[PDB]
Design an enzyme around this catalytic site. Structure first.
Site, PDB file in Angstrom:
ATOM      1  N   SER A  86       4.643   0.668  -2.800  1.00 25.15           N
ATOM      2  CA  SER A  86       6.119   0.728  -2.479  1.00 25.15           C
ATOM      3  C   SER A  86       6.734  -0.680  -2.626  1.00 25.15           C
ATOM      4  O   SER A  86       7.888  -0.819  -3.038  1.00 25.15           O
ATOM      5  CB  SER A  86       6.429   1.306  -1.118  1.00 25.15           C
TER       6      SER A  86
ATOM      7  N   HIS B 276       5.911  -4.561   4.042  1.00 23.38           N
ATOM      8  CA  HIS B 276       6.067  -3.617   5.132  1.00 23.38           C
ATOM      9  C   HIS B 276       4.771  -3.176   5.806  1.00 23.38           C
ATOM     10  O   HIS B 276       4.843  -2.430   6.767  1.00 23.38           O
ATOM     11  CB  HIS B 276       6.859  -2.387   4.672  1.00 23.38           C
TER      12      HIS B 276
HETATM   13  N1  LIG Z   1       5.413   8.612   1.955  1.00 22.53           N
HETATM   14  C1  LIG Z   1       5.084   7.375   2.461  1.00 22.53           C
HETATM   15  O1  LIG Z   1       5.343   7.046   3.604  1.00 22.53           O
HETATM   16  C2  LIG Z   1       4.413   6.435   1.549  1.00 22.53           C
HETATM   17  C3  LIG Z   1       3.565   5.423   2.116  1.00 22.53           C
HETATM   18  C4  LIG Z   1       2.854   4.649   1.299  1.00 22.53           C
HETATM   19  C5  LIG Z   1       2.938   4.742  -0.134  1.00 22.53           C
HETATM   20  N2  LIG Z   1       3.850   5.674  -0.656  1.00 22.53           N
HETATM   21  C6  LIG Z   1       3.886   5.947  -2.075  1.00 22.53           C
HETATM   22  O2  LIG Z   1       2.686   6.593  -2.473  1.00 22.53           O
HETATM   23  C7  LIG Z   1       2.349   6.299  -3.837  1.00 22.53           C
HETATM   24  C8  LIG Z   1       0.945   5.732  -3.908  1.00 22.53           C
HETATM   25  O3  LIG Z   1       0.869   4.454  -3.289  1.00 22.53           O
HETATM   26  P1  LIG Z   1      -0.476   3.629  -3.464  1.00 22.53           P
HETATM   27  O4  LIG Z   1      -1.684   4.468  -3.144  1.00 22.53           O
HETATM   28  O5  LIG Z   1      -0.267   2.328  -2.770  1.00 22.53           O
HETATM   29  O6  LIG Z   1      -0.394   3.390  -5.036  1.00 22.53           O
HETATM   30  P2  LIG Z   1      -1.424   3.106  -6.203  1.00 22.53           P
HETATM   31  O7  LIG Z   1      -2.547   2.285  -5.677  1.00 22.53           O
HETATM   32  O8  LIG Z   1      -0.641   2.646  -7.418  1.00 22.53           O
HETATM   33  O9  LIG Z   1      -2.078   4.528  -6.497  1.00 22.53           O
HETATM   34  C9  LIG Z   1      -1.489   5.464  -7.386  1.00 22.53           C
HETATM   35  C10 LIG Z   1      -2.580   6.116  -8.256  1.00 22.53           C
HETATM   36  O10 LIG Z   1      -1.926   7.094  -9.079  1.00 22.53           O
HETATM   37  C11 LIG Z   1      -2.634   7.130 -10.281  1.00 22.53           C
HETATM   38  N3  LIG Z   1      -1.770   7.735 -11.273  1.00 22.53           N
HETATM   39  C12 LIG Z   1      -0.738   7.153 -11.971  1.00 22.53           C
HETATM   40  N4  LIG Z   1      -0.220   8.061 -12.823  1.00 22.53           N
HETATM   41  C13 LIG Z   1      -0.943   9.222 -12.683  1.00 22.53           C
HETATM   42  C14 LIG Z   1      -0.933  10.526 -13.296  1.00 22.53           C
HETATM   43  N5  LIG Z   1      -0.028  10.815 -14.212  1.00 22.53           N
HETATM   44  N6  LIG Z   1      -1.833  11.435 -12.888  1.00 22.53           N
HETATM   45  C15 LIG Z   1      -2.760  11.197 -11.939  1.00 22.53           C
HETATM   46  N7  LIG Z   1      -2.821   9.954 -11.344  1.00 22.53           N
HETATM   47  C16 LIG Z   1      -1.938   9.001 -11.724  1.00 22.53           C
HETATM   48  C17 LIG Z   1      -3.029   5.664 -10.598  1.00 22.53           C
HETATM   49  O11 LIG Z   1      -4.008   5.488 -11.625  1.00 22.53           O
HETATM   50  C18 LIG Z   1      -3.352   5.129  -9.165  1.00 22.53           C
HETATM   51  O12 LIG Z   1      -4.738   5.093  -8.830  1.00 22.53           O
HETATM   52  C19 LIG Z   1       3.415   5.294  -4.310  1.00 22.53           C
HETATM   53  O13 LIG Z   1       4.477   6.005  -4.951  1.00 22.53           O
HETATM   54  C20 LIG Z   1       3.979   4.743  -2.999  1.00 22.53           C
HETATM   55  O14 LIG Z   1       5.286   4.227  -3.126  1.00 22.53           O
HETATM   56  C21 LIG Z   1       4.559   6.524   0.209  1.00 22.53           C
HETATM   57  O1  LIG Z   2       5.228   2.705   1.361  1.00 26.68           O
HETATM   58  C1  LIG Z   2       6.156   3.209   2.289  1.00 26.68           C
HETATM   59  C2  LIG Z   2       7.552   3.394   1.745  1.00 26.68           C
HETATM   60  C3  LIG Z   2       8.077   4.659   1.553  1.00 26.68           C
HETATM   61  F1  LIG Z   2       7.362   5.767   1.823  1.00 26.68           F
HETATM   62  C4  LIG Z   2       9.362   4.828   1.123  1.00 26.68           C
HETATM   63  F2  LIG Z   2       9.864   6.052   0.957  1.00 26.68           F
HETATM   64  C5  LIG Z   2      10.153   3.742   0.869  1.00 26.68           C
HETATM   65  F3  LIG Z   2      11.431   3.902   0.442  1.00 26.68           F
HETATM   66  C6  LIG Z   2       9.646   2.496   1.056  1.00 26.68           C
HETATM   67  F4  LIG Z   2      10.399   1.408   0.817  1.00 26.68           F
HETATM   68  C7  LIG Z   2       8.353   2.315   1.493  1.00 26.68           C
HETATM   69  F5  LIG Z   2       7.887   1.083   1.665  1.00 26.68           F
HETATM   70 ZN   LIG Z   3       3.841   1.480   1.905  1.00 20.26          ZN
END
Ligand SMILES: NC(=O)c1ccc[n+]([C@@H]2O[C@H](COP(=O)([O-])OP(=O)([O-])OC[C@H]3O[C@@H](n4cnc5c(N)[nH+]cnc54)[C@H](O)[C@@H]3O)[C@@H](O)[C@H]2O)c1
Ligand SMILES: OCc1c(F)c(F)c(F)c(F)c1F
Ligand SMILES: [Zn+2]
Ligand SMILES: NC(=O)c1ccc[n+]([C@@H]2O[C@H](COP(=O)([O-])OP(=O)([O-])OC[C@H]3O[C@@H](n4cnc5c(N)[nH+]cnc54)[C@H](O)[C@@H]3O)[C@@H](O)[C@H]2O)c1
Ligand SMILES: OCc1c(F)c(F)c(F)c(F)c1F
Ligand SMILES: [Zn+2]
Ligand SMILES: [Zn+2]
Ligand SMILES: [Zn+2]
Lengths: 374, 374
Positions: free
Chosen positions: B48, B67
Site C-alpha cells: 500500500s 503505516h
Molecule cells: N485491505 C487491507 O487492509 C490491506 C492491508 C494490507 C495490504 N493491502 C493490499 O493487499 C495487496 C497485497 O499487499 P502485499 O501482500 O503487501 O503485496 P505484494 O507483496 O506485492 O504481494 C502481491 C502478490 O501478488 C502477486 N501477483 C501480482 N499480479 C498477480 C496476478 N495477476 N495473479 C496472481 N498473483 C499476482 C505478486 O507476484 C505478489 O507476490 C496490495 O494491493 C495492498 O495494497 C490491503
Molecule cells: O495496506 C493498508 C491500506 C489499505 F488497505 C488501504 F485501503 C489504503 F487505502 C491504504 F492506504 C493502506 F495503507
Molecule cells: Zn498495509
C-alpha cells in the site's frame, strides 16, 4: 383412469418471445421412473415468467412456463417414495436432490440438478413430456405450471398439508418464500435494524414481511410506482420513497435517511443500476446487500470495489436461500399455523384461460400477484 | 526535555509520484490535545505504501507515508489517557474512536474518523505536524511512520506489551493482522474447507496462516511468480498454482481442482480482474470471496450479477476486520505467547536510511516484508 396414459389437456404455450401465450391442447406423457404427474389447481404470475416473454430470461422455446403453483398428484412413476396420488404438492423450481455437494452443505440451496444456470428446458433425463400440434414443447425450470397437467422429477416436488388452500399456498412455490427467506435467512436481518427494499412487487412485499418478522425498526420501501406504497406500509414499511421525487440519487437520499447507511438492503427489481444503488446505500463498514431481482441476460454491471473493501457484504440468492423440498412443507405448515399472511400479496384471481389478462395486469403496474385457477 | 518542543529529525518525504523517497530533515511539531508523539523503532514496507508512489492509491502530496510500524511514546498532549511516555505502541492506520456508529457496531471496524475513504492527509484537526524545507508536508492515514518521529491522534495509537520486540510486532500494524483477520474474522474460514488465496506476498501469506489456523483442509496459493510458492507452502499452502502454466482461465482451473469451486477465496493483489476471478472460483451456491487487495484509484470492475444470484457472498475489509485499538494489543500478547509466527514474513532487514533499496526489493519480486530500523 388416466394413469399410464397420455393426457390431452389445456396449457398455455409460449411459441416465441414477445407474443401472447397460446392457450391450447397439449399431450402430457405419463411419468417415467422417479417422475410425478400433477393436476394443477392454482398458479401465480411471477415477474420471472414475464422475463421469459420479454427476453430478459433466455430459456429454450417453445415452452410451457410457470413455476409458482400448487396441485394434486394424478400419478407417480416407478420408484417414487415421497408423494402419492391424491397428495397436495408444490413444484420446486429449485430442486433438492439431497445428494450433491450443495444439498449436503448446511447453507446451500442451489442444487446442482437445477435447470436455471444452463437451461435445457427438459426433464432430468433430457427429454420432454409435452407435445403440441405434434411438436415437442420445452419444460421450464423442471416445473411448467401453466398447464392443467405437468410432469416433474421427484426431486422437484414437495408434499404439503392435505388441508392447505392451494389458491393461496401456491405463493410458497416462489414469491413469498423468496422474499421472506431473502430477509430472514440470506440477509439474517436483525432486531432494531434499518432495511431498504427496492421494488415493492410480490417478492419485495415478502421481503418486507420477513424484515418485520425479524424485528427491523425501520423498513424503507423504494419504488418508482407510488401506487405500490400503501400495500408496502400495510405489510410493514415504515416509510416509502419514490426516486423520481428527488434531485439527488436515491442512494444518497437513503444514506441521509438512515444517518449514514442502512443495515440491510435488497434489490427486488432486476436492474443493474439498482443492484449497485442498493449496495451503495448500505452502511460501508457493516452493511449487507442482497440481490433478489433477475437481471437481463448476459449483461454485466460496473461497480467500484472500494464499496466492498470498506466492509460491505454483497450476496444474492435463489428461492430465499431455502432448501426447497425440506422448506416448502414447513412453510405451508407455518402458514396454516397463522405465522405469516399470504392474502396481502394477492390482488387478483382469474381463471387460467385469462392468463394473458393476468400478465397484462402485471405489466401495467396494477397487480401484485394474480392467481390463476384451473 | 524534547517535550513541548519542535523536533528536527530525518524522514522519508515523497515529493512527487513515481520518484524515490527523499531522506531529509523535517520538523515535527509537539502534540496538541489528544495527540501522541512517537519515536519510531521499526516500520515495514507494505505494498500500500508503494501504491502511494505509483499513484495506485491517491493521497495528497507531498507526504510522509508509512503505516505498518512500532515505536516508543516520546510525549503526550493534553488529555491523553491511553498511553504514556516510554510506552511501546503501534500506530493504527484504521482509527478506533470508540464513539461512532461503526465503532459501536459488533462487527464493524472501519471507523468514521478514518483518512482512507477520502484522504485529506492531515491530523484529525485538519492540520499537519510536519514541515520540510519550510513547507507543510501531508500525513498518511494519520500514521506517517516513515519518520524518526511522528505525531498521531490518540484514536490512532495502541499501547502494547512493554516486552514486545518492535522489529517483529510492527507487522501487526498492517500485513499480518490484515491477512490473518481476513481469513479468521471476515471470511470465517471453517474446519475442513478449501481456500484459494490470490497473491502470496506478506498479506497473502498471512491469509494462508489464518486459513491454516482455522483448520482448512486445502489451501491453494495462486501467484504468477513461482518464486513465492516455497514460502507459501511453509506457512500452510497445500498446493500452489501459477495461472501462466495453464491454457484455461484460472477460475476454471481452480473450479476443477476443487471439484466444483472453493469454500473461501481471497483476492490479495489489487487487480480488478483477479477480484472477479476470485469471486468466480468460489462455489456458486455457498462460496465466499473476500477482497483484500487495493484497487487502482477510481476504477470500476465489470461483473455478471448472476455470480451472486446463485448464492455467492462477496465482501471486502480493511485491516482484517479488526477493531484496531482493541485488537492490536491482544494480537501482540498472542504473538508473545507464540500463537502465530511473524518471522516467515520477514525476508529482509535494512536501516531506515536504505528505504529506497527496500522498495526496490519489493518491486523486483524478491522480498516479502523488509523491516526498516530507525
Ligand atoms: N485491505 C487491507 O487492509 C490491506 C492491508 C494490507 C495490504 N493491502 C493490499 O493487499 C495487496 C497485497 O499487499 P502485499 O501482500 O503487501 O503485496 P505484494 O507483496 O506485492 O504481494 C502481491 C502478490 O501478488 C502477486 N501477483 C501480482 N499480479 C498477480 C496476478 N495477476 N495473479 C496472481 N498473483 C499476482 C505478486 O507476484 C505478489 O507476490 C496490495 O494491493 C495492498 O495494497 C490491503
Ligand atoms: O495496506 C493498508 C491500506 C489499505 F488497505 C488501504 F485501503 C489504503 F487505502 C491504504 F492506504 C493502506 F495503507
Ligand atoms: Zn498495509
Ligand atoms: N431470486 C429469486 O429466486 C427470485 C424469485 C422471484 C422473483 N425474482 C425476481 O425478482 C424481481 C421482482 O419480482 P416481482 O416482485 O414478481 O416483480 P414485480 O411485481 O414486477 O415488482 C417489481 C417492482 O419494481 C418496481 N420498479 C421497477 N423499476 C424500478 C426502479 N427503477 N426503482 C424502484 N422500483 C422499480 C416496479 O414498479 C414494481 O413494483 C424480478 O426480477 C423477478 O424475476 C427472483
Ligand atoms: O422467480 C424465480 C426465478 C429466478 F429467481 C430465476 F433466477 C430464474 F432464472 C427464473 F426463471 C425464475 F423463475
Ligand atoms: Zn442437489
Ligand atoms: Zn418466481
Ligand atoms: Zn469510530
Amino acid at each position: 383412469s388416466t394413469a399410464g396414459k397420455v393426457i390431452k389437456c389445456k396449457a398455455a404455450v409460449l411459441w416465441e418471445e414477445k407474443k401472447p401465450f397460446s392457450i391450447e391442447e397439449v399431450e402430457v406423457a405419463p411419468p417415467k421412473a422417479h417422475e410425478v404427474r400433477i393436476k394443477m389447481v392454482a398458479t401465480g404470475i411471477c415477474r420471472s415468467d414475464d422475463h421469459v416473454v420479454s427476453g430478459t430470461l433466455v430459456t429454450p422455446l417453445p415452452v410451457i412456463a410457470g413455476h409458482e403453483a400448487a396441485g394434486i398428484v394424478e400419478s407417480i412413476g416407478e420408484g417414487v417414495t415421497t408423494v402419492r396420488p391424491g397428495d397436495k404438492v408444490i413444484p420446486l423450481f429449485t430442486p433438492q436432490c439431497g445428494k450433491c455437494r450443495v444439498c449436503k452443505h448446511p447453507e446451500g440451496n442451489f442444487c446442482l440438478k437445477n435447470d436455471l444456470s444452463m437451461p435445457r428446458g427438459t426433464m432430468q433425463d433430457g427429454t420432454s413430456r409435452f407435445t403440441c400440434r405434434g411438436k415437442p414443447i420445452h419444460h421450464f425450470l423442471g416445473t411448467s405450471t401453466f398447464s392443467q397437467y405437468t410432469v416433474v422429477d421427484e426431486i422437484s416436488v414437495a408434499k404439503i398439508d392435505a388441508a392447505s388452500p392451494l389458491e393461496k399456498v401456491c405463493l410458497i412455490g416462489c414469491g413469498f418464500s423468496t422474499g421472506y427467506g431473502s430477509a430472514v435467512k440470506v440477509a439474517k436481518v436483525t432486531q432494531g435494524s434499518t432495511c431498504a427494499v427496492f421494488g415493492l412487487g410480490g417478492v419485495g412485499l415478502s421481503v418486507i414481511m420477513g424484515c418485520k418478522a425479524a424485528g427491523a425498526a425501520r423498513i424503507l420501501g423504494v419504488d418508482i410506482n407510488k401506487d405500490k406504497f400503501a400495500k408496502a406500509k400495510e405489510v410493514g414499511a415504515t416509510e416509502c420513497v419514490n426516486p423520481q421525487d428527488y434531485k439527488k440519487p436515491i442512494q444518497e437520499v437513503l444514506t441521509e435517511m438512515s444517518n449514514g447507511g442502512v443495515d440491510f438492503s435488497f434489490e427486488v427489481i432486476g436492474r443493474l443500476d439498482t443492484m449497485v444503488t442498493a449496495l451503495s446505500c448500505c452502511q460501508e463498514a457493516y452493511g449487507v446487500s442482497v440481490i433478489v431481482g433477475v437481471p437481463p441476460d448476459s449483461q454485466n454491471l460496473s461497480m467500484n470495489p472500494m464499496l466492498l473493501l470498506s466492509g460491505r457484504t454483497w450476496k444474492g440468492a435463489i428461492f430465499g436461500g431455502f432448501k426447497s423440498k425440506d422448506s416448502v412443507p414447513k412453510l405451508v405448515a407455518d402458514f396454516m399455523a397463522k405465522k405469516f399472511a399470504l392474502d396481502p400479496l394477492i390482488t387478483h384471481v382469474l381463471p387460467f384461460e385469462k392468463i394473458n389478462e393476468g400478465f397484462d395486469l402485471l405489466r401495467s403496474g396494477e397487480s401484485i400477484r394474480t392467481i390463476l385457477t384451473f
